[PDB]
Design a protein around this ligand. Structure first.
Ligand code: A1ACA
Ligand code: A1ACA
Ligand code: CL
Ligand code: CL
Lengths: 4, 124, 124, 4
């Protein structure tokens, strides 16, 4: 999971 | 927004759609290319091809279970492109590049047409 | 093999499937969550959820146009997860995390359950 | 396009  | 994103989600979705294709699950159309038949999901075809997007948004053609392609279309070129739609991988070879590019132009698959043109330009 | 790969293909496919969803094109099922209704593509639901995969591979349920979820399921949690299926983006907030995790467990969406558990563990 |  990432900060888009 | 303040959303988080799962990097591999799109790839995992496509991998599962290809698994459904391999097991012939919920396929809803047959694409006829001369003597060959290819089962697929209308939604995946529309998502990958400007031609299929136009076909399945038509109020009459959206309901067809069989679509016949132009007789000039090569079944191997179509097969290579159908595999690319469901996998992101393109089996581009010296022996098939002309048929693949002609099929991608007909199907309106701009990124495929672009790499074919570049690979052809490199060999001239 | 000797294939080439188009990096953005899977993301572009999903973006187009979400565009079809937004315009209600070729949606083939309604998911009922209490008083709310959500139109979707069976194939996308199966590709994202172990529960929908099991439902639409069943020889009788595969033909249903309406699926009713358990009354304990929160419509907002379902909406957030449906958006994630079609976009890879999850709108996870302090106010919705419990409903989202409960919905992802029911839907069998393992990666979503995992990030919810981690975000909850960080706040304790 | 890349070599996967
Ligand atoms: O080279 C390409 C690939 C492609 C795909 C689509 N498909 C869709 N396009 C839009 Cl804007 N909305 C929903 C869908 Br499905 C249209 C055109 C093209 N040209
Ligand atoms: O957390 C998750 C997400 C998910 C998706 C599917 N979907 C499919 N799985 C397989 Cl193996 N083939 C085709 C399809 Br469609 C099955 C289980 C799960 N569990
Ligand atoms: Cl393309
Ligand atoms: Cl997930």
């Amino acid at each position: 999971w990432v900060i888009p | 927004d303040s959303c988080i994103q799962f990097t591999r989600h799109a790839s995992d979705v496509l991998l599962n759609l290809n698994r459904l294709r391999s097991r012939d699950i919920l396929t809803d159309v047959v694409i006829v290319v001369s003597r060959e038949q290819f089962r697929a999901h209308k939604t995946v075809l529309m998502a990958c091809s400007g031609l299929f997007y136009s076909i399945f948004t038509d109020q009459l053609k959206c309901n067809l279970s069989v679509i016949n392609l132009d007789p000039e279309i090569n079944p191997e070129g179509f097969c290579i492109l159908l595999d690319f739609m469901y996998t992101s991988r393109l089996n581009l070879r010296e022996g098939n590049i002309m048929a693949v590019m002609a099929t991608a132009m007909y199907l309106q698959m701009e990124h495929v047409v672009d790499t074919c043109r570049k690979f052809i330009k490199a060999s001239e």
